[model samples]
Target: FYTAPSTESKFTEVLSKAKLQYPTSTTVAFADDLLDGYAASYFYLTSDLYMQFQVAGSSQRSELREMETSGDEAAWDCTGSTAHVASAQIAIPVQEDGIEEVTILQVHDSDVTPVLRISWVSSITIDGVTSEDVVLATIRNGIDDSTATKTVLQAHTTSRTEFNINVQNSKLSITVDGTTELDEADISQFDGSTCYFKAGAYNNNPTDTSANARIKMYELEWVDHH
Candidate 1:
């Protein structure tokens, strides 16, 4: 519910800064029970140009790895002009419910266009358990080289947007700002239960200029009912 600050601090300090308090150390007679219905979530807000999320024990380091390595799809150049921007990612773990939903909040520098994406697979081996992966939603906007608008202008300030996806009845529905963008994709087509979420800015014209694009993640949430 809270965005971690950008200050330089240790884990303990960061937690404290977020108003979270915990004992320095604790020992219990009984083993701590891991929750079966727990979710893993991550959020990144930085001035860096690249962002990615990987499974707990996967060889892939970033979303770009999946794009370049996976034969199912090709890399997409989302930026039209060269501009420096920031980026971040959020990964959430969910148990299979009869229904599933996810929401993401993204903020981008006004001068830079924001790019947000979410993808998942259903069958993944995590700690010896097989899970499902699903792609909830994806959006990328800037400039395209094929068009006459060859020069994409950066935003004067940062802008914020929200995206959400819901899956049920063998279909996936995606929405941005309450408007539907994608509808009714076969959910069974996705491979795993646990999946990765990625977002960032793309330097569509990587060769033309040194400007980098970036995107920041403010929130990630998931809900499931089985």
Candidate 2:
């Protein structure tokens, strides 16, 4: 018989050197008892470890509660020939009224805006029936609000989803469930930028009290090919 570790310990092992940000604009070390107003928690079922992250819609600043790679230590230059890969398996909440969209993963420049955002868009109307879909957006010019090229990756997706974001050879690619959804998209515009990885939930509709975003991360792995 094998011994199982606690969820918090497992989470810490996965993100051993990361920073956690909550909805209240508070940054904390990744450890136990992270119940910041029902925003973060850790639990386990049988032998599986899971970390739950949530952000209330009424919260300010886009209501984001995420885990990002630590400061300068984790930042990498896009001009170099190094590979940064982030792989995660997570379960997103079912789409409901008032929930507009939620950003699940990001590639952000050091102390700057995100260059790529992978989001779960709720209530997308196709033909007539509404459904949810996962989309990927590449920010052109390294500006958060700048016009981005959006591409839908998966439709009617609910529950557990696996995704991998790869940045290498001056290009970016996204893989969902082992299939290449976005293949080597050009990111030359950010060639001089220093970037890192961020994951969790970032609610788009922050003003609506009824809107919220929750994500359960089952597995998170990082690979840095220096």
Candidate 3:
């Protein structure tokens, strides 16, 4: 890992290098699905993965993350049928009072929309007074910053939380530290869609570099289930 002096030049170099460590993906989310919105910038380490997103002088400023984003963009096929679950251990190194972020675990449609945005939230509350409730963000059909797509998957939250977004025979469910929060089982249609995941700083904020938030991802792995 390398440290920086906060200069524009130094920050730029590391951000591109971050991509070397954590490669990005296509299928950004709502709207223009077949092209660039994701696959921008990301970084990771042996101990943790750093997904740094900024709008320093750019247009799109949302921090979306993914892995193995290679294949037919039109087809956008999914993982194997056996059963796969993507998960990680994460923490927010840079947090602001008003800004909110949630770890997004979603299944992307062939067109780059959402089959499901099963996710866990942080402590930026409007739902209640729970730790998990605050940071819990997810949606289906069309992904964006609206309660219409948001779900209070977990009862509460903690400083550093552990979560899981699992894809089964034909459904999706979220777990908080091993506790099942929101379970959707009518997703039998998922067999025909593409599967992708976003796990990082999905900051619900204005596109200002000063407002950029950083996610400290300690671990990320894909469980090959039998």
Candidate 4:
């Protein structure tokens, strides 16, 4: 028998619809038909457990915000400016075993230029305190700015990026354009194994200074395959 707790009300409803009940110690058993007379029958008898939840449902929506720009005539702060950005954070609990693979999918406007980042922490914190670090994927300077003419770029450049991290190490392996960039680092350090997704543009010289460059994130999907 395998059991998984529901993270949201919708997930709970789905579980109820499936008629799947929680497993007890006595409820779990090996399938005799599949493992008869096998040496590893005991292992085959064990249950493989998992939870299923939709990442882009109505209740689990993405968050968006604008970036503030301040001009320092004295050139004191180099942080620069930003506007109309989006972020998404999802929490998937691991109860029995660790995760084996993570897949992230995102949809954004071609004119907006999107970036995806993943970090694993012990707990959620706003002041930079964390337990570990893991950057699964990053797509920087991906949008081509030279192909359009408008206040900011009238035409959308619809694009999609997918990242797959699979290896033996606990740290995430980043791959972009069929290339591997970084290696293992502490991924679950500060925030109880939390990961974040942020997308936006930085320091883009546009035709209109008043026009705010934006990145509208439509969906985010995280899968744990062990």
Please give the distance, in angstroms, between residue 108's alpha carbon in candidate 1 and its true position after superposition. 23
Winner of 2 and 3 under lDDT: 2
Candidate 1 lDDT over residue span 1-226, tens digit each? 3222322232222122111101111211011111111111222223332121211111111112111122222222222121112122333333223212222222221222323334332233434644444333333323222211111111112334345655444344556445666664443322222222223222221222322122343433332333
- Overall lDDT per candidate, in order of appearance: 0.27, 0.62, 0.44, 0.24
Q: What ordering of candidates by TM-score runs from best to worst?
A: 2, 3, 1, 4
Cα RMSD (angstroms) for every candidate in the order listed: 19.3, 5.5, 8.5, 21.7
Q: lDDT of model 1 at residue 41? A: 25
Stretches of candidate 4 above 4 Å error?
1-170, 191-193, 196-210, 216-220
| TM-score per candidate | 0.31, 0.76, 0.57, 0.24
Residues forming the 10-long window of minimal summed lDDT in candidate 1: 27-36
Q: Which candidate should be chosen as best, given lDDT against the real structure?
A: 2
Candidate 1 — which residues are off by over 4 angstroms? 1-158, 191-196, 199-205, 208-211
Angstrom error of the Cα, residue 14, model 3: value is 19
Candidate 1, lDDT over the whole model: 0.27
TM-score of 2: 0.76
Error of 1 at 201 (Å): 5.5
Order the candidate numbers by lDDT, best to worst: 2, 3, 1, 4
**Off by more than 4 A, model 3:** 1-80, 101-104, 118-133, 142-149, 155-158, 189-191, 205-209
Q: Candidate 2 on 98-147: residue-level lDDT in tens?
A: 66677777887766567788877754554465555655454555554476
Q: Give the per-residue lDDT digits (tens) of candidate 3, residues 23-43.
A: 224333421221212334332
